[PDB]
């Protein structure tokens, strides 16, 4: 409805960012998503499924298919890869993008730190501020879905504001209260 | 030697400038985007004659249009900075704008505009009257934006703080301990042949803006966003100009001991996490040598381990330390 450029950021750019990306896009928002990790990591505990950022979601689908089509059908990972391939081609890395946002939402504190470190590491040119918010989302299928509803709810509330900068601290404060959550909120510059 | 390129480009923008007076504000922004990519990009020569066409749209009722004018004028000072006196008036005028969205965008653009404008004016050997006029508007822009730290809008205040950061950095001297930054410009880069202003007066202003930022940073009713922005701006200033390091470290020390009671528990965590990062950055600067133990004290208060802090301190040779240790002893007397 409103002209907010939003980004959702996680480790992977696979589960939690894509659940939120999906729901925000369906609400009509100019949304993009990214991962803060070095490489794309999917689920033995010491044996994960690793791929590069820039790898098509479809290539990851065919790789896990030919490895073991049955295991990744039972854990619903192929269902996730389905959703993501419909949203965009390949998962992207936040640290490499030249896109600018009004709001950035991270799904855990460790991601938040990564985003903030990165943004700060780059000298500001446009002098344009951006709000970085952290909403904790526990990394599993069920909680990534519930989390994506919260993030959507939070961005909807923020989209309603006629002056976001001037109202955002009050909005967060009362949102935190009503939803019994802690939203870390910082400001960074492009 | 000639060709068709200029004439073919002029015919394209004449068409676009004619559509503007009868176009909807949404169509006006599309048209202006195309006119800027041509007139400041593909065929840069077309700048001077289509200037007034674009600058007239600074009076348009739609704020998006007004914001596009700012975007254009900011580009003009980047690629055709010789046109600076012919555009700078609209910028000072747009700082009196009614829409906060326009004010914020103008302050943002004034960062590059003031740097590019200051670089160009002190480069001129025989500066004219138009150069004195442009400098006077730049002086007023600084004062205008400086007043906006007491604006009622939080977003305006944030942008104003960020603008003031670049001014302090420009209007101070770099040294050996300054962070290596590509386009870095200091009062050392301002020539003695320049009549337009004096290095001492700019330094005096830079020191006054810093004093204002240091005081602002220490108030009890500051917003969490303004506080975070101010803290990071103070960090940029100290790492760029380590002469201000002691003052910034003291401000940080005072803040961590007296967090404004207007901050929420979340805001405190947010402020402290940002403060931690700024302190870590400053500890990497060679100019922080004298304040290494103070900074360590605060980082320990903010949860850093002994080994995390230790890894940040730059390695120095003993002769370098002795130079510094003895400079610190002579300055104390």
Swiss-Prot record, chain B:
Transmembrane segments: none
HEAT repeat ranges per the UniProt record: 6-41, 44-78, 81-123, 130-169, 201-240
Domain of life: Eukaryota
Disulphides: none
Entry's localization field: Nucleus
Observed phenotype of the null mutant: RNAi-mediated knockdown results in overproliferation of testicular cystocytes undergoing transit amplification leading to increased incidence of spermatogonial tumors.
Coiled coil: none
Family as reported in the entry's similarity comment: Belongs to the Symplekin family.
Domain commentary: The HEAT repeats have been determined based on 3D-structure analysis and are not detected by sequence-based prediction programs.
Subunit structure: Interacts with Cpsf73 and Cpsf100 forming a core cleavage factor required for both polyadenylated and histone mRNA processing. Interacts with Slbp and Lsm11.
Role noted for this protein: Component of a protein complex required for cotranscriptional processing of 3'-ends of polyadenylated and histone pre-mRNA. Involved in germline stem cell transit amplification, differentiation and mitosis-to-meiosis transition.
Protein name per the record: Symplekin
Organism, scientific name: Drosophila melanogaster (Fruit fly)
Organism lineage: Eukaryota, Metazoa, Ecdysozoa, Arthropoda, Hexapoda
Gene: Sym
Portion of the parent chain present: 19 to 350 of 1165
